Design a protein around this ligand. Structure first.
Ligand SMILES: O=P(O)(O)O[C@H]1[C@H](O)[C@@H](OP(=O)(O)O)[C@H](OP(=O)(O)O)[C@@H](OP(=O)(O)O)[C@H]1O
Ligand SMILES: O=P(O)(O)O[C@H]1[C@H](O)[C@@H](OP(=O)(O)O)[C@H](OP(=O)(O)O)[C@@H](OP(=O)(O)O)[C@H]1O
Lengths: 288, 288
């Protein structure tokens, strides 16, 4: 039985079933129809987001994107190991969902795939907890499931004809400099009309952080920091990056550091639109 | 001005700039995480591949290999003359990219280095076309570039501490018997843990052909021909050697002949694992 430590992490099922719908899908362009302030530069974005989809959720997302549209990149922002069991999204969870904190991206991927390969070799996976059970620390009350499939996200993304690109952000935290560099380079290295579907585990903090970064890179020279944050918070699930006191109070320092990073990334973005040509890491060494 | 004939071939710049990233890098071992069929014998391969890198792409490849690991051999599969101008990959292109078709390997190398030596002696190289310009036959719209450096691939491979080994395969075609012999001998003449980075011009047909040959030599006695081809097609760029009708229809005969060769190479590989001890050329004389 698991106990939520990194030595005995828990298998947590995120999808209620393999048919569960997407509940935090949204498109950034819709901000232009709801936000009452500066909407300059919004309505052209080719940008959607969600929480981790079930197997069937990937169908709904692919359909939503087809209706609004070119190349599609699914942007997985999750550092932690995750995948699918019988079409249900699953995560390998240690306290605060930081199983891969401090690891190189290569090691994060290796540890996830060694885990999925291990599950895939079993006829029955034991100890599968729901999110309520994990929160309630009912570690021994998990279900035993006959394995039909064990898959990584790539399996479902590739099936839709989309590309997959992973940015290894720790849950509840700001991206590290390597991952900021990676996101800026990804955007620059692909056509302006590329569609990006951004997702995290819950489709809240990491997803909305990256949405704001996209916005800043295009518009920081024409829209104030406050209005970028506020307009990103204007569409469901109304995630406001200004808020640093959330349901889990012990995470406040990471929400504070995340907003502080966004302050600095805004200045980088603004200066980049005014002539600066280096990377985020280079700018940060000189300016922070 | 060039006209794409062998008498007046074109200088075509393959890298957008000297900083352009690698877009078709992949490692064969990753098949074990994506392919839903027989993955026997895959996850141990020390094998990566790509298209022709820019100067900066060689950095990214060297870093990727270091993270996954011993001796490293860069396997250049390109018969045609190619090199670098100011860190951008360049090719000397006649119709279908067959400038060196029918030449001995020694002559191919001599013609390439006489060409690079010629460019290196100039202060300005004229007529440098992009791939779009060449496709559009805009032979006179090429750019004139001040020469900072002119280098062959060896310059960048040696800089990384890697070995360089060339297999002279014509674009869009199967390897000739001498080059099959050379590849089998190279693999046999180096330790099992040798890392190979295989590349062609586009990182598609020739690269994936050689990947499949590596796979067959190790696993043809335990994996069906169909599953070897299918599993090699399971990772980006999803190059499927079974497909014989591609974007350029006039090349279909060469894609057909390439698949036919792979059928025969599979039987050679299988018999070799069951006792046969001769070379490909010897086997082919007796069995085809
Ligand atoms: O998917 P579940 O298991 O529900 O967990 C979610 C994810 O961790 C969210 O982050 P992300 O979307 O990046 O994966 C997190 O957002 P933040 O911690 O950044 O706020 C949510 O915290 P709450 O905001 O308290 O709901 C948390 O409930
Ligand atoms: O690098 P560029 O200039 O883009 O040209 C590429 C190379 O010729 C590819 O072969 P290789 O990787 O061996 O160099 C070829 O693969 P095949 O002809 O074998 O299929 C591609 O054809 P397409 O598959 O049609 O894209 C072609 O577009």
């Amino acid at each position: 039985v698991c106990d939520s430590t990194i030595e005995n992490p828990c298998i947590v099922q995120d999808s209620k079933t393999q048919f569960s719908p997407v509940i935090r899908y949204r498109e950034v362009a819709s901000i232009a129809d709801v936000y009452g302030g500066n909407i300059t530069g919004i309505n052209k974005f080719h940008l959607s987001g969600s929480e981790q989809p079930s197997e069937k959720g990937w169908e709904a997302i692919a359909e939503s994107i087809s209706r609004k549209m070119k190349k599609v990149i699914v942007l997985d922002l999750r550092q932690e190991s995750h995948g699918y069991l019988n079409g249900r999204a699953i995560t390998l969870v240690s306290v605060y969902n930081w199983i891969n904190l401090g690891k190189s991206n290569s090691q994060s991927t290796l540890d996830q795939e060694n885990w999925l390969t291990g599950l895939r070799s079993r006829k029955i996976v034991n100890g599968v907890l729901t999110v309520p059970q994990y929160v309630a620390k009912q570690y021994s009350q998990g279900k035993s499931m006959v394995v039909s499939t064990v898959k990584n996200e790539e399996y479902y993304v590739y099936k839709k004809g989309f590309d997959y690109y992973r940015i290894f952000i720790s849950d509840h935290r700001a991206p590290l400099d390597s991952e900021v560099d990676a996101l800026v380079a990804l955007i620059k290295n692909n056509p302006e009309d590329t569609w990006y579907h951004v997702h995290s585990r819950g489709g809240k903090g990491r997803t909305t952080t990256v949405f704001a970064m996209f916005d800043m890179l295009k518009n920081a020279d024409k829209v104030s920091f406050e209005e970028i944050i506020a307009r990103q918070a204007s569409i469901p699930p109304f995630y406001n990056l200004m808020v640093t006191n959330r349901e889990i109070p012990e995470l406040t320092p990471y929400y504070e550091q995340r907003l502080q990073f966004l302050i600095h990334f805004y200045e980088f973005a603004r200066q980049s639109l005014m002539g600066y040509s280096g990377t985020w890491s280079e700018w940060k060494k000189l300016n922070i």
